[model samples]
Target chain A: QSQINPHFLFNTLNTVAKMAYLEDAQQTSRLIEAVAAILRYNLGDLQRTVTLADEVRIAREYFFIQQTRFFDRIKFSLEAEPSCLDQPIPPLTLQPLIENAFIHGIETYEQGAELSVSVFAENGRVVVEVRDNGVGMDEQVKAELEALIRGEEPRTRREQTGIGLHNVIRRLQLFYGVMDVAEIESALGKGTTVRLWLPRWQG
Target chain B: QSQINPHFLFNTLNTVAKMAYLEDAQQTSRLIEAVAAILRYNLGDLQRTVTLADEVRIAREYFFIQQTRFFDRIKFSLEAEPSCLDQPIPPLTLQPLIENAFIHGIETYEQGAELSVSVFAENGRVVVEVRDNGVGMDEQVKAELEALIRGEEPRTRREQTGIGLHNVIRRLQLFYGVMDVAEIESALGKGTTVRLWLPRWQG
Candidate 1:
């Protein structure tokens, strides 16, 4: 459960920027800025709620960094109902799904990898779904992942970093004080979709 | 057991450096380089042994970042036996102790803070000691820390980041496959000293 200490992380980043500047790598510098923004957003309020708009802002930044690293091999799209922008949600809820898409869905592919995020309101709840068009999971692996998400099975360290889908769902369940907060659907060749049903915030 | 992803960390740091450059903060840029070096050193070969020379190099960079932050309120000195520099040891074995001295001993002080690192050899063993001339711990706190280092007690989240001495010692124990790798001595209002006795490597 050791994390990269934030103080160390922030200081190290500032150091990297200096080297990048000396080398006249403007693009590198820009990418670093996006990363810094996302770091601030991720670490700022670890145990708090943020507006959907806030999460999107950081998600876009995250996507930019990924896109830069992946180049033209990947595409990202985001769509949110204007009204849902003000809706309350846990921090970092979207970025992980997007990241999973990049790591599992797209990284191995040579081209034609696509990921999209859509947010809408449904049945007095907010629905946020992440869709990825990449190598999908088989029924067995899918069941294992779903079991991991529900905390029915322990996750190995490998799954801990590669696909942190479980972490996100568990956090959602804990924050909302409910059990059924997420759903997953995927096919072997088509793609994957992760949908989150979040309770409306009263505060 | 969740931690910040390394990919996200590196990207964020690059972005910060860019913003610092945009604002024409040369010092910030320099600081970022120090951090990047430390990060690379820390994350690189996480499971392998590094020469004392390598550890010292990153320790110096870590000190530079800290000194930059403390600015005239702190002094740092490093004395590594030239011959002992080639001795093999765990990476990050020194930096965490130095960081602990800063967080627990020096950071609260306004002035007259001093920290030093001494490395030498004895009885076919390499010894590293980080000393701080700042507010030291009481015997009770010292005992609690020692117990924590020994994994004799549970650590709260606050202690996890502030004084990661436990993590350091545990890593050393696992790396060296031996107990009795560390020692701590301190007196309230005087200072603290953390010493490590590392077994020499044959390879």
Candidate 2:
């Protein structure tokens, strides 16, 4: 059960998609196919590096799926500089930040939650920023999360569920082989931003 | 978020189902609504007691979703005695057993996974059994799982990922305030069965 057979999962999803198609449920089929795509990406080798654009595409799809559920309450947008699009990074990086934003940041509100991802080049390093205008955080909570990102706090069972911000930050540090790779900015009742700095891979 | 806002989650799912309806994807909407129902049941008070029929209904729906995925590889059925249907038990009981059977017992194969749920009276107590004709287990693994179920083996971080067999067994013991409430039988390369005895509540 720890290792779900990728082929099995994909084949089953395709079958479900086919069933939806036969019933003339094109949108349903489309959604199922989208889910399959996400699964395929997730099931692939976690160690492999991917372009920023690739991660952006998957993150967009993740947002699309969430949008179907939060149609009126959430809005998402993405902007990437041409140079940063080809920048190599780990897979499944952006989606976690977006998930945190949608679930913890904005999900409390009935409406008017804005989220966006911006990738750009800053001082010869690639920078990725995920911003959300929703329920921000108390100063204490933000401080704790910052420490978690810095690996100053031990991850407890409660914080270990899902990818979460801690995992993403830790992954970036390990992949880049450097500290000071990430930062968080948050204001209570206002918004939050997660910024990442990825130094160019020498190899 | 550490704890998901159940109301927000339910409301968002309801909105998604409505969107599916607006687009004339009746089946799509139906599927989403089914997902919503599952979520509702999961988000409800987990400590509340429910009828055997209620668990069966939810288990059926869980299988239906899996069927859509494992269209050709999996088959599921349920049988409950008329008298057992009204028996009061804990909520969200049967679905985990079915899930464990699907994921561990049978999901490896390409086709021909047979699964079933049966609820009947035994020794004046309600007996619920989940059976699967799929890949079983080695004797050692089976013994280890049995020990885990009996609380003889400490649950490691690895086994704590999902609502696996151990959680269900532990929950049953805690709810019924008894230890001799569950059993597991498996044969390597053949199949597996999980049985539970729910003592009638005198309160």
lDDT (10s digit) by residue, model 1, range B79-159: 988888887676767877888777664665778788889998888777899999877866776787677656586545572
Best candidate, lDDT-wise?
Answer: 1
Per-residue alpha-carbon lDDT of model 1 for A1-203, expressed as tens digits? 34346666765555555555666667667776777676667656567878889989988888887775666788889999988888777787887888877665565578878888999999888899999887785677678667765668654557244226776787788888876788888877778898988887745
Q: Candidate 2, what DockQ? A: 0.17
Which residue runs does candidate 2 get wrong by more than 4 Å?
A1-16, A39-46, A66-75, A103-112, A148-151, A154-161, A188-190, B1-16, B43-46, B66-75, B103-113, B148-151, B154-161, B188-190
Task: Tell me how far the alpha carbon of residue A6 in candidate 2 is from the true structure, in angstroms, after superposition.
Answer: 12
Error of 2 at B71 (Å): 5.7
Which numbered prediction scores highest in DockQ against the true structure?
1
- Model 2, B1-203: lDDT tens per residue? 22122343356446545545666766656566656666677766767888888888877766766776667888888898877888777776787787777766455577778888999888867899999887775677667667866668654656142345666677788888887788888877778898898886533
- Local accuracy of candidate 2 as per-residue lDDT tens digits, A1-203: 12112343355455545656666766656566666677677767778988887898887766766776667887888898876788778777887777777765466677888888899888868889999887685677677777866668654656132355666777787888876788888877778898888895533
| TM-scores, all models, native as reference | 0.83, 0.80
Question: What is the TM-score (0 to 1) of candidate 2?
Answer: 0.80
